[PDB]
Design a protein around this ligand. Structure first.
Ligand SMILES: COc1cc(F)cc2c1nc(C)c1c(C)nc(-c3ccncc3C)n12
Ligand SMILES: [Cl-]
Ligand SMILES: [Mg+2]
Ligand SMILES: [Zn+2]
Length: 322
């Protein structure tokens, strides 16, 4: 594991967020894009506002964040910027549904979101579970997600990085379990079944947040919603992020080609023309249903569904040639 320097965390400790950002960070639509240097500080701020200034020891939190950043790779999409975008969306959901979640869950989710794609290499689970890379042998299913959780624990195990050490033995194992299930939920393969079960529970009136299995599922859907959140930004931001997503997809197709294997259209750079149709397909089958079910369970999350609907409309315009 890569460790942060003394200057990085001490600098973060000293960091103060400008006044104008305080109001904007509360909004679902907020884009972290223009404030790169402020990203670690934005996370500290969100943790302090949701959990409290004394929830974690400042020094441990700043060492933890700075080492988490160092363990994200310089890949086009599944990087540090993605981690912070996902954490911000979680913050907006938690702020708008505050008392539905325990202090331990809010702490656990904000941390899980920042750590959810730790050490990502820009390669899918399918790629690993085919050309049997060591990771797929270690983790048969949700390959990268089990690795992201393993990396989260290894960062906590670094000297003076354990932010949860002050919790009781029961609360510490609970927080890790919240984190583990949250990170596993970000395996898109699991989302489809999770949303269907949630749709059924809500529709029949079976859904019950005091039921731990129901609670685990709702958290899971929140994880997908935060993971997918670039589809809820303003069109220029959404469009530019989509270019990073496909840069990784095409690079996977390129590595497949070098190894003598034909990639799917989505991962084929010689098939760029099919992208708008693939995105419409993605919004209709994955994104729109995700935000629709989430809005049903947590009504204050409706602006995410509206923003996703606007971007679906922008992909439709691209298709018709407008
Ligand atoms: C066909 O269009 C896609 C296929 C796909 F599989 C994943 C896609 C995706 N289009 C978008 C916009 C997108 C966003 C924001 N996030 C993800 C995502 C979620 C989980 N794991 C990896 C990715 C890339 N996707
Ligand atoms: Cl690493
Ligand atoms: Mg992931
Ligand atoms: Zn992700």
């Amino acid at each position: 594991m890569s460790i942060c320097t003394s200057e990085e965390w001490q600098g973060l400790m000293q960091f103060t967020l400008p006044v104008r950002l305080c109001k904007e960070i509360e909004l679902f639509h907020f884009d972290i894009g223009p404030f790169e240097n402020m990203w670690p500080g934005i996370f500290v701020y969100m943790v302090h506002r949701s959990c409290g200034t004394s929830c974690f020891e400042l020094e441990k939190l700043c060492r933890f964040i700075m080492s988490v950043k160092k363990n994200y790779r310089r890949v086009p999409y599944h990087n540090w910027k993605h981690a912070v975008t996902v954490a911000h969306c979680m913050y907006a959901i938690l702020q708008n549904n505050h008392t539905l979640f325990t202090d331990l869950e809010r702490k656990g989710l904000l941390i899980a979101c920042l750590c959810h794609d730790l050490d990502h290499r820009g390669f899918s689970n399918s790629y690993l579970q085919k050309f049997d890379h060591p990771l797929a042998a270690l983790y048969s299913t949700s390959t990268m997600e089990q690795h992201h959780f393993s990396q989260t624990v290894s960062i906590l195990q670094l000297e003076g990085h354990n932010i949860f050490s002050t919790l009781s033995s029961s609360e510490y194992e609970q927080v890790l379990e919240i984190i583990r299930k949250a990170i596993i939920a970000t395996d898109l393969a699991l989302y489809f079944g999770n949303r269907k079960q949630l749709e059924e529970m809500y529709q029949t009136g079976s859904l019950n947040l005091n039921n731990q299995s129901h609670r685990d599922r709702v958290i899971g859907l929140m994880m997908t919603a935060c993971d997918l959140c670039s589809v809820t930004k303003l069109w220029p931001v959404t469009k530019l992020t989509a270019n990073d997503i496909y840069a990784e997809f095409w690079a996977e197709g390129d590595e497949m080609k070098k190894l003598g294997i034909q990639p799917i259209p989505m991962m084929d750079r010689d098939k760029k023309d099919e992208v708008p149709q693939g995105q419409l397909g993605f919004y209709n089958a994955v994104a729109i249903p995700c935000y629709t079910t989430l809005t049903q369970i947590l009504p204050p999350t409706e602006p995410l569904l509206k923003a996703c609907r606007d971007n679906l409309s922008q992909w439709e315009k691209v298709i018709r040639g407008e």
